[PDB]
Design a protein around this ligand. Structure first.
Ligand SMILES: [Hg+2]
Ligand SMILES: [Zn+2]
Length: 259
């Protein structure tokens, strides 16, 4: 190791040495076995209210690129589904692969997608993000798979700014981006209790993974693979394969909102 990453020497199989919770009882991602997920008719439809979303900035943090939102008020929230209370969007980011046949963190019946989008929200009852991650119901992550096919118009503004945040630590102003353009048509989902997928790997997440993938074009995903893990003036290491493999389900049940 040294600092964690996705390489041979500091990749997911090493994390447990600095972050023992890596071998925990509620680690993510998982494989979603569709024939073993339990339909639960008591789950409510999700409620995504992103019409007042305020994006602020896009940042290359060395492991992905995050688009950050103003979370000082209830502007872009998620509620409903399996959640109690209101969760505010704080940031979204992707995980992707070096090839189109891999890239997602969750799998479906062992199927891997080209990428996976995570919309990260935190439970307002805890007052701030940093307090939320210390609680079992502190975050709610919506995960959306991407397959390669048609271009997604609403992703192009993201794609286009990537050249300006090529290396670790770079940021760019990124206002007026509407995350509604990244949702599939259907909001049917699976849900289970899990964790963050990067260190510190805290088990504070209710995952909501959407059944329906979105399509992106090959060119679009190609632009993701041009980013760098390294900082400026360091030897170039392309930012690819920044996904953690599926972890054991252990004593958990995946619930479906649909049949
Ligand atoms: Hg936690
Ligand atoms: Zn993620």
């Amino acid at each position: 190791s040294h600092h964690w990453g996705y390489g041979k020497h500091n990749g997911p199989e090493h994390w447990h040495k600095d972050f023992p919770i890596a071998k925990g009882e509620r680690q993510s991602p998982v494989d979603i076995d569709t024939h073993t997920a339990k339909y639960d008719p008591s789950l409510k439809p999700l409620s995504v209210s992103y019409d007042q979303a305020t994006s602020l900035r896009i940042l290359n943090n060395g492991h992905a690129f995050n688009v950050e939102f103003d979370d000082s008020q209830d502007k872009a929230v998620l509620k409903g589904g399996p959640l109690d209370g209101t969760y505010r969007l704080i940031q979204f980011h992707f995980h992707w692969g070096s090839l189109d046949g891999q890239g997602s963190e969750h799998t479906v019946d062992k199927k891997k997608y080209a990428a996976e989008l995570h919309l990260v929200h935190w439970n307002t009852k805890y007052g701030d993000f940093g307090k939320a991650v210390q609680q079992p119901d502190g975050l709610a992550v919506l995960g959306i798979f991407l397959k390669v096919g048609s271009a997604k118009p609403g992703l192009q503004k993201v794609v286009d700014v990537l050249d300006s945040i090529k290396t670790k630590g770079k940021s760019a102003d990124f206002t007026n981006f509407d995350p509604r353009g990244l949702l599939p048509e259907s909001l049917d989902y699976w849900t289970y209790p899990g964790s963050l997928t990067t260190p510190p790997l805290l088990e504070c997440v209710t995952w909501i993974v959407l059944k329906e993938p979105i399509s992106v074009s090959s060119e679009q995903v190609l632009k993701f693979r041009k980013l760098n893990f390294n900082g400026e003036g360091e030897p170039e290491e392309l930012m690819v394969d920044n996904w953690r493999p599926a972890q054991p389900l252990k004593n958990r049940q995946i619930k479906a909102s649909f049949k």
